Design a protein around this ligand. Structure first.
Ligand SMILES: *[C@@H]1O[C@H](CO)[C@@H](O[C@@H]2O[C@H](CO)[C@@H](O[C@@H]3O[C@H](CO[C@H]4O[C@H](CO)[C@@H](O)[C@H](O[C@H]5O[C@H](CO)[C@@H](O)[C@H](O)[C@@H]5O)[C@@H]4O)[C@@H](O)[C@H](O[C@H]4O[C@H](CO)[C@@H](O)[C@H](O)[C@@H]4O)[C@@H]3O)[C@H](O)[C@H]2NC(C)=O)[C@H](O)[C@H]1NC(C)=O
Ligand SMILES: CCCCCCCC/C=C/CCCCCCCC(=O)O[C@H](COC(=O)CCCCCCCCCCCCCCC)COP(=O)(O)OC[C@@H](O)CO
Ligand SMILES: CCCCCCCC(=O)OC[C@H](COP(=O)(O)O[C@@H]1[C@H](O)[C@H](O)[C@@H](OP(=O)(O)O)[C@H](OP(=O)(O)O)[C@H]1O)OC(=O)CCCCCCC
Ligand SMILES: CCCCCCCCCCCC(=O)OC[C@H](COP(=O)([O-])O)OC(=O)CCCCCCCCCCC
Ligand SMILES: CCCCCCCCCCCCCCCC(=O)O
Lengths: 88, 171, 71, 121
């Protein structure tokens, strides 16, 4: 999931009230990779949102088609969100 | 061989040297060669996705005047692909880059998306709001859409070429 | 449990999925035969009557094969 | 496209160093190796290093050639000491996870252009 952008070493004396205690610290800077999320979560959401706009190009009188499209897009987005919440 | 999803093909035994911060050390190594079993993912993931894409393409053979039927059909096919993709990716490790099955699922999902867009484009040019009566020789009636007529060839053909390229690249 | 290879449960679920898929394809065939090839001619009821018998019988045969081969 | 550019000398009377820079893909997890091909069309394994910095060598060049890797620069170097006339050959830089291999050329999916090395006495 991550890539180590940088690592640092620092030595310092923590000045505690009793006295100065030595300390070393090894830090890593981790950057998360988005190839996971570009495919898993962003692309289906974007394409479902795009599909939701197909209702605008259907005639107003075609109530069943437009309603089914819109509400099933709502259901698909709910499914995506819920299962994403479970997996993540 | 207590392996479920792998086949232990064999072992390769070797020896080498590692130069660490404290000195050189002899390191004796073995390498167990494993190959994954593919039948599970064929039956559970690839083949339902293929049949769902085939379903999404079957919409082109319905009459253009069945607007609610084709609309529900395409959008529910998109929902089915969403469910299949979620179930498929539940059974993977959380790697960053894209696996082959991820690409297959994405391509199939794009195919069903394009099928629904194709139906929308076909419906945009539909003139009459009634289908063929059943006892007329062509009152006027809607002609069969050219978009549908050549999509029936273009979509299965493109899916077949993609399948051939995919199953030649990896196998 | 996650056992990544084919099992009897997988075969049964696959067969049932194929059956429902074929029923949907059957209606698609009926619709194409009526509205698609119909203008050119000038029986879909025959296709429906055939399906009503074949689908239950084929499913029963599939169940018999499954419940004999595995039990 | 993934490329493995190779650098180093070709003529020595002797010590030499043949470097290999990889571009197009990160080979941190892959086993980077060197192969030799003398005239007559036989490829010979020379050395290899894995992700664990573990060095494998061929018997013919054990204790003579030293293989090292720069994981930050994504490169592999082969230091050749004690060259003899029979070492004249084309040296190939290879990378790839070692499946059924680590000593077989078939296990490596990436190869370099090669570098000709000659030794004269
Ligand atoms: C991740 O995130 C963490 C945050 O938690 C980062 O950690 C911190 O890292 C930075 C560097 O990246 C540290 O800065 C340095 O500390 C050194 C220590 O030297 C000093 O220590 C002496 C005791 O041994 C002390 O007497 C001197 O004085 C100062 O230091 C004390 C600490 O004792 C402090 O209270 C004051 O700041 C005093 O002024 C002595 O300086 C310090 O030298 C560094 O400063 C230098 O940089 C310039 C340019 O090089 C140099 O010219 C100067 O001399 C200047 O002093 C710097 O302050 C910091 O201490 C870390 N903090 C903790 C809590 O750990 C980590 O780096 C991140 N890593 C990654 C990979 O993202
Ligand atoms: C019009 C549009 C056209 C579009 C074009 C569509 C074309 C359709 C492409 C299909 C590709 C199929 C995947 C091929 C991948 C190759 C996979 C393969 O080599 O076969 C075996 C795996 O499969 C398997 O046994 C599992 C087989 C499961 C079979 C289930 C029966 C389903 C019947 C329902 C009908 C199916 C066909 C429908 C296709 C449309 C290998 O394993 P093997 O044997 O060595 O060891 C036992 C095993 O458990 C471990 O591997
Ligand atoms: C896959 C490639 C698809 C290429 C599709 C491109 C195929 C193509 O170029 O055909 C034209 C198409 C519309 O064709 P379509 O068949 O739907 O429309 C017919 C015709 O165009 C007239 O509208 C009518 O004839 P006429 O006037 O009354 O005589 C006739 O009705 P009727 O006569 O029965 O009453 C209509 O049926 O419009 C686009 O370009 C779609 C945008 C591209 C959409 C791209 C979708 C992916
Ligand atoms: C009107 C019809 C309503 C039916 C609903 C109720 C079905 C309940 C059937 C009971 C199934 C059962 O318990 O079978 C167990 C035995 C094996 O016994 P054992 O020795 O292994 O313990 O046999 C087996 O090996 C398992 C076989 C399972 C048989 C499947 C029955 C198919 C039902 C058709 C539904 C239309
Ligand atoms: C952003 C895209 C949203 C979904 C798809 C909507 C467009 C599908 C219907 C096509 C309408 C465009 C028809 C152009 C023909 C013309 O020149 O009048």
């Amino acid at each position: 999931q991550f890539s180590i952008v940088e690592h640092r070493l620092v030595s310092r004396n923590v000045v505690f009230a009793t006295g100065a205690y030595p300390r070393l610290s090894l830090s890593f800077r981790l950057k998360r990779n988005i190839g996971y999320f570009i495919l898993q979560t962003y692309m289906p959401s974007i394409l479902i949102t795009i599909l939701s706009w197909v209702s605008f190009w259907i005639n107003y009188d075609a109530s069943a088609a437009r309603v089914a499209l819109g509400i099933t897009t709502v259901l698909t987005m709910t499914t995506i969100n819920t299962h994403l919440r479970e997996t993540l | 061989s207590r392996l479920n999803q792998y086949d232990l093909l064999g072992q390769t035994v070797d020896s080498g040297i590692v130069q660490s911060s404290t000195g050189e050390y002899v390191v004796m190594t073995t390498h167990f060669h494993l190959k994954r079993k593919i039948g599970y993912f064929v039956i559970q993931t690839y083949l339902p996705c293929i049949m769902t894409v085939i379903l999404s393409q079957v919409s082109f053979w319905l009459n253009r005047e069945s607007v609610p039927a084709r609309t529900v059909f395409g959008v529910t096919t998109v929902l089915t692909m969403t469910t299949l993709s979620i179930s498929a990716r539940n059974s993977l490790p959380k790697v960053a880059y894209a696996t082959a099955m991820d690409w297959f699922i994405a391509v199939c999902y794009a195919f069903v998306f394009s099928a629904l867009i194709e139906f929308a484009t076909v419906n945009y040019f539909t003139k009459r709001g009634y289908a063929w009566d059943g006892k007329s020789v062509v009152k006027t009636f809607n002609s069969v859409s050219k978009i549908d007529r050549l999509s029936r060839i273009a979509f299965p053909l493109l899916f077949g070429i993609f399948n051939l390229v995919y199953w030649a690249t990896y196998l | 449990p996650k056992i990544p290879y084919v099992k009897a449960i997988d075969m049964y679920l696959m067969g049932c999925f194929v059956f429902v898929f074929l029923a949907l394809l059957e209606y698609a065939f009926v619709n194409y035969i009526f509205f698609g090839r119909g203008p050119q001619r000038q029986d879909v009821n025959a296709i429906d009557r055939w399906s009503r018998i074949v689908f239950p019988f084929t499913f029963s045969l599939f169940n018999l094969v499954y419940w004999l081969y595995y039990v | 496209q993934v490329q493995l550019q190779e650098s180093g000398g070709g003529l020595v009377q002797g010590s030499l160093r043949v470097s290999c820079a990889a571009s197009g893909r990160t080979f941190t997890t892959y086993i980077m190796a060197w192969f030799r091909q003398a005239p007559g069309k036989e490829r010979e394994f020379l050395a290899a290093m894995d992700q664990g910095r573990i060095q494998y060598y061929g018997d013919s060049v054990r204790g003579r050639f030293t293989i090292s890797r720069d994981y930050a620069k994504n490169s592999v170097d082969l230091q050749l000491d004690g060259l003899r006339p029979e070492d004249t050959a084309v040296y190939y830089c290879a990378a790839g996870a070692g499946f059924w291999g680590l000593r077989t050329a078939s296990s490596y999916h990436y190869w370099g252009q090669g570098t000709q090395v000659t030794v004269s006495s």
